[PDB]
Coordinates of N, CA and C in Angstrom, one line a residue:
Chain A
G1 N -32.9 -48.8 -42.2 CA -32.8 -50.1 -42.8 C -34.1 -50.9 -42.7
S2 N -34.2 -51.9 -43.7 CA -35.3 -52.8 -43.7 C -34.9 -54.0 -44.6
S3 N -35.8 -54.8 -45.0 CA -35.5 -56.0 -45.8 C -35.1 -55.6 -47.2
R4 N -35.6 -54.5 -47.7 CA -35.3 -54.0 -49.1 C -34.8 -52.6 -49.2
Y5 N -35.0 -51.8 -48.2 CA -34.5 -50.4 -48.2 C -33.4 -50.2 -47.3
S6 N -32.4 -49.4 -47.7 CA -31.2 -49.2 -46.9 C -30.5 -48.0 -47.5
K7 N -30.3 -46.9 -46.7 CA -29.6 -45.7 -47.2 C -29.1 -44.9 -46.0
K8 N -27.9 -44.4 -46.0 CA -27.3 -43.6 -45.0 C -27.4 -42.1 -45.4
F9 N -28.1 -41.4 -44.6 CA -28.4 -39.9 -44.9 C -27.3 -39.1 -44.1
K10 N -26.3 -38.7 -44.8 CA -25.3 -37.8 -44.2 C -25.8 -36.4 -44.1
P11 N -25.9 -35.8 -42.9 CA -26.4 -34.4 -42.8 C -25.4 -33.4 -43.5
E12 N -26.0 -32.4 -44.1 CA -25.2 -31.4 -44.8 C -25.5 -30.0 -44.1
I13 N -24.5 -29.2 -44.0 CA -24.6 -27.8 -43.4 C -24.2 -26.8 -44.4
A14 N -25.1 -25.8 -44.6 CA -24.9 -24.7 -45.5 C -26.0 -23.6 -45.3
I15 N -25.8 -22.5 -45.9 CA -26.7 -21.3 -45.8 C -27.6 -21.3 -47.0
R16 N -28.9 -21.6 -46.7 CA -29.9 -21.7 -47.8 C -30.7 -20.4 -47.9
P17 N -31.3 -20.1 -49.0 CA -32.2 -19.0 -49.1 C -33.4 -19.1 -48.2
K18 N -33.9 -18.0 -47.7 CA -34.9 -18.0 -46.7 C -36.3 -18.3 -47.4
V19 N -36.9 -19.4 -47.0 CA -38.2 -19.8 -47.4 C -39.1 -20.0 -46.2
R20 N -40.2 -19.3 -46.1 CA -41.1 -19.3 -44.9 C -40.3 -18.8 -43.7
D21 N -39.5 -17.7 -43.9 CA -38.6 -17.1 -43.0 C -37.8 -18.0 -42.1
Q22 N -37.3 -19.1 -42.8 CA -36.5 -20.1 -42.1 C -35.3 -20.4 -42.9
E23 N -34.1 -20.4 -42.3 CA -32.9 -20.6 -43.0 C -32.6 -22.0 -43.4
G24 N -33.0 -23.0 -42.6 CA -32.7 -24.4 -42.8 C -33.4 -25.1 -43.9
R25 N -33.2 -26.4 -43.9 CA -33.8 -27.2 -45.0 C -34.0 -28.6 -44.4
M26 N -34.9 -29.4 -45.0 CA -35.2 -30.7 -44.5 C -35.8 -31.6 -45.6
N27 N -35.2 -32.7 -45.8 CA -35.6 -33.7 -46.8 C -36.4 -34.8 -46.2
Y28 N -37.7 -34.9 -46.6 CA -38.6 -35.9 -46.1 C -38.5 -37.2 -46.9
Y29 N -38.7 -38.3 -46.3 CA -38.6 -39.6 -46.9 C -39.7 -40.5 -46.5
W30 N -39.9 -41.6 -47.3 CA -40.9 -42.6 -46.9 C -40.5 -44.0 -47.5
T31 N -41.0 -45.0 -46.9 CA -40.7 -46.4 -47.3 C -41.8 -47.3 -46.9
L32 N -41.9 -48.5 -47.5 CA -42.9 -49.5 -47.2 C -42.2 -50.6 -46.4
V33 N -43.0 -51.2 -45.5 CA -42.5 -52.3 -44.7 C -43.5 -53.4 -44.9
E34 N -43.0 -54.6 -45.3 CA -43.8 -55.8 -45.5 C -44.3 -56.4 -44.1
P35 N -45.3 -57.2 -44.1 CA -45.6 -57.9 -42.9 C -44.5 -58.8 -42.4
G36 N -44.3 -58.9 -41.1 CA -43.2 -59.7 -40.6 C -41.8 -59.1 -40.8
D37 N -41.7 -57.8 -41.1 CA -40.4 -57.2 -41.4 C -40.0 -56.4 -40.3
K38 N -38.8 -55.8 -40.4 CA -38.2 -54.9 -39.4 C -37.7 -53.6 -40.1
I39 N -38.0 -52.5 -39.5 CA -37.4 -51.2 -39.9 C -36.5 -50.7 -38.7
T40 N -35.4 -50.0 -39.1 CA -34.4 -49.6 -38.1 C -34.1 -48.2 -38.3
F41 N -34.0 -47.5 -37.2 CA -33.6 -46.0 -37.2 C -32.4 -45.9 -36.2
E42 N -31.2 -45.7 -36.8 CA -30.0 -45.5 -36.0 C -29.4 -44.2 -36.4
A43 N -29.2 -43.2 -35.5 CA -28.6 -41.9 -35.8 C -28.0 -41.3 -34.6
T44 N -27.2 -40.3 -34.8 CA -26.7 -39.5 -33.8 C -27.1 -38.0 -33.8
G45 N -28.1 -37.7 -34.7 CA -28.5 -36.3 -34.8 C -29.1 -36.1 -36.2
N46 N -29.7 -34.9 -36.4 CA -30.3 -34.5 -37.7 C -31.2 -35.5 -38.2
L47 N -32.1 -36.0 -37.4 CA -33.1 -37.0 -37.8 C -34.4 -36.7 -37.1
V48 N -35.4 -36.5 -37.9 CA -36.8 -36.4 -37.3 C -37.4 -37.8 -37.4
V49 N -38.1 -38.3 -36.4 CA -38.4 -39.7 -36.2 C -40.0 -39.8 -36.2
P50 N -40.5 -40.8 -36.8 CA -42.0 -40.9 -36.9 C -42.6 -41.1 -35.5
Chain B
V1 N -9.4 -20.4 -60.0 CA -8.2 -21.1 -59.6 C -7.7 -20.5 -58.3
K2 N -6.7 -21.2 -57.7 CA -6.1 -20.7 -56.4 C -5.4 -19.4 -56.7
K3 N -5.9 -18.3 -56.3 CA -5.3 -17.0 -56.5 C -4.2 -16.8 -55.4
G4 N -3.0 -16.4 -55.9 CA -1.9 -16.3 -55.0 C -1.5 -17.6 -54.4
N5 N -1.7 -17.8 -53.1 CA -1.4 -19.0 -52.4 C -2.6 -19.5 -51.6
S6 N -3.8 -19.2 -52.0 CA -5.0 -19.7 -51.3 C -6.2 -19.6 -52.2
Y7 N -7.2 -20.3 -51.8 CA -8.5 -20.3 -52.5 C -9.6 -20.0 -51.4
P8 N -9.8 -18.8 -51.0 CA -10.7 -18.5 -49.9 C -12.1 -18.9 -50.2
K9 N -12.9 -18.9 -49.1 CA -14.3 -19.2 -49.2 C -15.1 -18.3 -50.1
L10 N -15.9 -18.9 -51.0 CA -16.7 -18.1 -52.0 C -18.1 -18.2 -51.7
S11 N -18.8 -17.1 -51.7 CA -20.3 -17.0 -51.4 C -20.9 -15.8 -52.1
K12 N -21.8 -16.1 -53.1 CA -22.4 -15.0 -53.8 C -23.7 -15.5 -54.4
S13 N -24.7 -14.6 -54.7 CA -26.0 -15.1 -55.1 C -26.5 -14.2 -56.2
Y14 N -27.6 -14.6 -56.8 CA -28.3 -13.8 -57.8 C -29.8 -13.9 -57.5
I15 N -30.5 -12.8 -57.6 CA -31.9 -12.7 -57.4 C -32.6 -12.5 -58.7
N16 N -33.5 -13.5 -59.1 CA -34.2 -13.4 -60.4 C -35.2 -12.3 -60.3
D17 N -35.1 -11.3 -61.2 CA -36.0 -10.2 -61.3 C -36.5 -9.9 -62.7
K18 N -36.0 -10.6 -63.7 CA -36.4 -10.3 -65.1 C -37.7 -11.0 -65.6
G19 N -38.7 -10.9 -64.7 CA -40.1 -11.3 -65.0 C -40.3 -12.6 -65.8
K20 N -39.4 -13.6 -65.6 CA -39.4 -14.9 -66.3 C -38.4 -15.8 -65.6
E21 N -38.5 -17.1 -66.1 CA -37.6 -18.1 -65.6 C -36.2 -17.9 -66.2
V22 N -35.2 -18.5 -65.5 CA -33.8 -18.4 -66.0 C -33.0 -19.7 -65.7
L23 N -32.4 -20.3 -66.7 CA -31.4 -21.4 -66.4 C -30.1 -20.8 -66.0
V24 N -29.5 -21.4 -65.0 CA -28.2 -21.0 -64.5 C -27.3 -22.2 -64.5
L25 N -26.5 -22.4 -65.5 CA -25.7 -23.6 -65.6 C -24.3 -23.5 -65.1
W26 N -23.9 -24.5 -64.3 CA -22.6 -24.5 -63.7 C -22.0 -25.9 -63.7
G27 N -20.8 -26.0 -63.1 CA -20.2 -27.3 -63.1 C -19.4 -27.5 -61.8
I28 N -18.8 -28.7 -61.6 CA -17.9 -29.1 -60.5 C -16.8 -29.8 -61.1
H29 N -15.6 -29.3 -61.0 CA -14.4 -29.9 -61.5 C -13.9 -31.0 -60.5
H30 N -13.4 -32.1 -61.1 CA -13.0 -33.2 -60.3 C -11.5 -33.6 -60.7
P31 N -10.5 -33.0 -60.1 CA -9.1 -33.2 -60.4 C -8.7 -34.7 -60.1
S32 N -7.8 -35.1 -60.9 CA -7.4 -36.6 -60.9 C -6.6 -36.9 -59.6
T33 N -5.7 -36.1 -59.2 CA -4.8 -36.5 -58.1 C -4.7 -35.4 -57.1
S34 N -4.2 -35.7 -55.9 CA -4.1 -34.8 -54.8 C -3.2 -33.6 -55.1
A35 N -2.2 -33.9 -56.0 CA -1.3 -32.8 -56.5 C -2.1 -31.8 -57.3
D36 N -3.1 -32.3 -58.1 CA -4.0 -31.4 -58.8 C -4.9 -30.6 -57.8
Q37 N -5.3 -31.3 -56.7 CA -6.0 -30.5 -55.6 C -5.1 -29.4 -55.1
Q38 N -3.8 -29.7 -54.8 CA -2.9 -28.7 -54.2 C -2.5 -27.6 -55.2
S39 N -2.6 -27.9 -56.5 CA -2.2 -26.9 -57.5 C -3.4 -26.1 -58.0
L40 N -4.4 -26.8 -58.6 CA -5.6 -26.1 -59.1 C -6.4 -25.5 -58.0
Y41 N -6.3 -25.9 -56.8 CA -7.0 -25.4 -55.6 C -6.0 -25.3 -54.5
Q42 N -6.5 -25.0 -53.3 CA -5.6 -24.9 -52.1 C -5.9 -25.9 -51.0
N43 N -7.2 -26.1 -50.7 CA -7.6 -27.0 -49.6 C -7.9 -28.4 -50.1
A44 N -7.4 -29.4 -49.3 CA -7.7 -30.8 -49.7 C -9.2 -31.1 -49.5
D45 N -9.7 -30.9 -48.2 CA -11.1 -31.0 -48.0 C -11.8 -29.8 -48.5
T46 N -13.0 -30.0 -49.1 CA -13.7 -28.9 -49.7 C -15.1 -29.3 -50.0
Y47 N -16.1 -28.4 -50.1 CA -17.5 -28.7 -50.3 C -18.0 -27.7 -51.3
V48 N -18.9 -28.1 -52.2 CA -19.6 -27.3 -53.2 C -21.1 -27.2 -52.8
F49 N -21.6 -26.0 -52.8 CA -23.0 -25.9 -52.5 C -23.7 -25.0 -53.4
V50 N -25.0 -25.3 -53.8 CA -25.9 -24.4 -54.5 C -27.3 -24.5 -53.9

Protein backbone atom coordinates (compact mmCIF):
# COMPACT_ATOMS: atom_id res chain seq x y z
CA GLY A 1 0.00 0.00 0.00
CA SER A 2 0.83 3.66 -0.50
CA SER A 3 -0.98 6.95 -1.13
CA ARG A 4 -1.75 5.96 -4.74
CA TYR A 5 -0.84 2.26 -5.18
CA SER A 6 -2.70 -0.63 -3.56
CA LYS A 7 -2.88 -4.26 -4.68
CA LYS A 8 -3.24 -7.61 -2.92
CA PHE A 9 -1.03 -10.29 -4.49
CA LYS A 10 -2.58 -13.69 -3.83
CA PRO A 11 0.05 -16.43 -4.26
CA GLU A 12 -0.67 -19.16 -6.78
CA ILE A 13 0.61 -22.74 -6.75
CA ALA A 14 1.09 -24.79 -9.93
CA ILE A 15 3.64 -26.83 -11.89
CA ARG A 16 5.40 -24.58 -14.40
CA PRO A 17 7.74 -25.54 -17.26
CA LYS A 18 11.39 -25.68 -16.28
CA VAL A 19 13.26 -22.45 -17.08
CA ARG A 20 16.86 -22.12 -15.87
CA ASP A 21 16.36 -25.60 -14.31
CA GLN A 22 13.88 -24.19 -11.78
CA GLU A 23 10.26 -25.26 -11.43
CA GLY A 24 8.88 -22.15 -9.73
CA ARG A 25 7.96 -18.67 -10.90
CA MET A 26 8.13 -15.13 -9.51
CA ASN A 27 6.45 -11.89 -10.58
CA TYR A 28 8.47 -8.75 -9.86
CA TYR A 29 6.83 -5.37 -9.22
CA TRP A 30 7.78 -1.74 -8.73
CA THR A 31 6.13 1.47 -7.59
CA LEU A 32 6.92 5.12 -6.89
CA VAL A 33 6.72 6.80 -3.49
CA GLU A 34 6.27 10.56 -3.21
CA PRO A 35 8.14 12.64 -0.61
CA GLY A 36 6.44 12.51 2.76
CA ASP A 37 4.57 9.32 1.84
CA LYS A 38 4.32 5.84 3.35
CA ILE A 39 4.74 2.42 1.75
CA THR A 40 3.49 -0.71 3.51
CA PHE A 41 4.42 -4.39 3.21
CA GLU A 42 2.09 -6.81 5.01
CA ALA A 43 2.20 -10.51 4.18
CA THR A 44 2.27 -14.02 5.62
CA GLY A 45 4.50 -15.60 2.97
CA ASN A 46 5.43 -15.76 -0.71
CA LEU A 47 6.86 -12.23 -0.62
CA VAL A 48 10.38 -11.10 -1.46
CA VAL A 49 11.13 -7.83 0.32
CA PRO A 50 13.42 -4.95 -0.77
CA VAL B 1 -17.56 -32.46 -19.15
CA LYS B 2 -17.83 -34.49 -15.95
CA LYS B 3 -17.28 -38.05 -17.14
CA GLY B 4 -19.28 -40.58 -15.16
CA ASN B 5 -19.59 -38.99 -11.72
CA SER B 6 -16.30 -37.07 -11.45
CA TYR B 7 -14.03 -34.62 -13.26
CA PRO B 8 -10.53 -35.77 -12.28
CA LYS B 9 -7.45 -33.57 -12.34
CA LEU B 10 -6.22 -32.82 -15.87
CA SER B 11 -2.59 -32.18 -16.79
CA LYS B 12 -1.01 -32.43 -20.24
CA SER B 13 1.46 -30.43 -22.29
CA TYR B 14 2.73 -29.79 -25.82
CA ILE B 15 6.33 -29.21 -26.89
CA ASN B 16 6.76 -26.88 -29.85
CA ASP B 17 9.02 -28.54 -32.42
CA LYS B 18 7.71 -27.43 -35.83
CA GLY B 19 10.50 -24.89 -36.38
CA LYS B 20 8.25 -21.83 -35.94
CA GLU B 21 5.82 -20.07 -33.62
CA VAL B 22 2.37 -21.45 -32.83
CA LEU B 23 -0.81 -19.94 -31.42
CA VAL B 24 -2.64 -22.21 -28.98
CA LEU B 25 -6.12 -20.81 -28.30
CA TRP B 26 -8.25 -22.00 -25.39
CA GLY B 27 -11.03 -20.79 -23.11
CA ILE B 28 -12.46 -20.93 -19.61
CA HIS B 29 -16.16 -21.60 -19.18
CA HIS B 30 -18.01 -19.71 -16.44
CA PRO B 31 -21.28 -21.45 -15.52
CA SER B 32 -24.08 -19.29 -14.18
CA THR B 33 -25.16 -21.20 -11.06
CA SER B 34 -23.74 -23.72 -8.60
CA ALA B 35 -26.12 -26.31 -10.05
CA ASP B 36 -24.31 -25.77 -13.35
CA GLN B 37 -21.06 -26.31 -11.43
CA GLN B 38 -22.41 -29.60 -10.07
CA SER B 39 -23.73 -30.78 -13.45
CA LEU B 40 -21.28 -29.51 -16.08
CA TYR B 41 -18.39 -30.26 -13.69
CA GLN B 42 -17.98 -32.06 -10.38
CA ASN B 43 -15.98 -29.97 -7.89
CA ALA B 44 -17.22 -26.63 -6.58
CA ASP B 45 -13.75 -25.23 -5.92
CA THR B 46 -11.51 -25.49 -8.98
CA TYR B 47 -8.55 -23.77 -10.61
CA VAL B 48 -7.43 -23.37 -14.23
CA PHE B 49 -3.75 -23.09 -15.08
CA VAL B 50 -1.69 -22.59 -18.23
